[PDB]
Design a binder for this molecule. Sequence first.
Ligand SMILES: *[C@@H]1O[C@H](CO)[C@@H](O[C@@H]2O[C@H](CO)[C@@H](O[C@@H]3O[C@H](CO[C@H]4O[C@H](CO)[C@@H](O)[C@H](O)[C@@H]4O[C@H]4O[C@H](CO)[C@@H](O)[C@H](O)[C@@H]4O)[C@@H](O)[C@H](O[C@H]4O[C@H](CO)[C@@H](O)[C@H](O)[C@@H]4O)[C@@H]3O)[C@H](O)[C@H]2NC(C)=O)[C@H](O)[C@H]1NC(C)=O
Ligand SMILES: [Tb+3]
Lengths: 300, 138
Amino acid sequence: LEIWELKKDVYVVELDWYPDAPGEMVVLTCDEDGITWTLDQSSEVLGSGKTLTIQVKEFGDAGQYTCHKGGEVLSHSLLLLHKKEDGIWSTDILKDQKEPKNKTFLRCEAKNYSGRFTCWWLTTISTDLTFSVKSSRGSSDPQGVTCGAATLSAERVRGDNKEYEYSVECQEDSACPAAEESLPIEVMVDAVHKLKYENYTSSFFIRDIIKPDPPKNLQLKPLKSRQVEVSWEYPDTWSTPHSYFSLTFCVQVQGKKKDRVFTDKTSATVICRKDASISVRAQDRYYSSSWSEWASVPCS
Amino acid sequence: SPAWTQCQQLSQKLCTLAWSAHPNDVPHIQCGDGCDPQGLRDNSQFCLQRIHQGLIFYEKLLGSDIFTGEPSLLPDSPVGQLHASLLGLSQLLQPEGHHWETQPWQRLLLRFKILRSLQAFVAVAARVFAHGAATLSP
Ligand SMILES: *[C@@H]1O[C@H](CO)[C@@H](O[C@@H]2O[C@H](CO)[C@@H](O[C@@H]3O[C@H](CO[C@H]4O[C@H](CO)[C@@H](O)[C@H](O)[C@@H]4O[C@H]4O[C@H](CO)[C@@H](O)[C@H](O)[C@@H]4O)[C@@H](O)[C@H](O[C@H]4O[C@H](CO)[C@@H](O)[C@H](O)[C@@H]4O)[C@@H]3O)[C@H](O)[C@H]2NC(C)=O)[C@H](O)[C@H]1NC(C)=O
Ligand SMILES: [Tb+3]
């Protein structure tokens, strides 16, 4: 319906916005005399009885409605607006990262095939924000995915204004790391800024958002010339066993030219030089997902 | 029973060719198919039969109208060797005495959808044969 329950005593009113739009007719209910109705914190009484009918046309009609009996509050009803213009719902709370594709508001990442992943999103708003995250694998017959609470994770200054980063951790309830995914994971995020309601969705396979941790224990062992034996290990967070979930690596010798070597072993022999570094990063060997961050160690 | 190191080499070449080509009723390596490490130890025939079923599935699509007709594939397209490598690997998995073999122009979208689904399938198959060659091999 055009009005529906989001949470207990919280209701979303879908508003088709255009000049002189009629809005929606909302009927309320109080969970028998003196039953006056107020809006926010004004004593101006707007109705009596268990039911109250109001025409919601703008944000001024949204807010917290309260049925009052004899100076005693009995129930509350919060009305949020989901604004729709020319067919598109508003997306003003979250910033469009616009990569990898346009209209990308949520970006997610996984370090292994365990079914655990993290999703991030950005906003220029600093207060009065409420986020709620839900997830599932499949849409028809949804499989269980459990998400934690969305929290403020970072705060950067981009231009004059400040960017606020929020993150959430989710885990597929019954994950199968080795199976070939056929149904994508869906992530759904409700966003509330004061009286404005919006929501955002992201759909992906775990294999497509893989980004391994950097190679660990990167060491150098000179030989006698400029040759040096480079060695490293799989990261601790990567899926096991490694004979199944194999990684491939890129070894780089760079000074502040670029000599790059691609290998499947955890070791290599390169040539060092003055004020140059040896860097190694990892990637799923059999599926071209994201490269890991560089793990680096200086020569000599 | 299967040449593990030969299957590892062919399945690794499949992953390379599948990504060189593309830089519902579909068979998938599901969870209960035994292609996980523990499932390959108990019995690998279940996994290898599912892999063979997927290989012949994608082999038929690559040789079908979806890829044979126009827009004509570039003369040096990796799809040609990709179809041959699919047949080469599925042939290695068929044991003796067993017979496992059983409109708009804007369908270029379906080509990329098939190859994207193929990249996911051969990735799991490559992990199976690499794990089997490392553990279930003399
Ligand atoms: C992100 O924001 C979106 C825009 O606000 C939001 O979409 C809206 O979601 C609400 C909550 O689900 C919808 O209201 C509900 O509608 C239900 C009936 O609609 C569906 O169920 C019927 C079978 O029961 C089907 O016959 C209908 O065709 C319909 O299926 C539609 O599903 C989606 C919308 O969900 C639509 O896109 C499809 O095309 C289908 O047409 C009602 O049953 C609900 O009522 C509940 O409560 C009442 C009162 O207590 C009870 O009587 C009911 O039994 C039931 O319990 C409720 O009214 C709303 O219609 C959606 N709007 C639009 C424009 O689609 C979306 O949900 C948000 N995303 C997230 C993750 O929250
Ligand atoms: Tb209406």
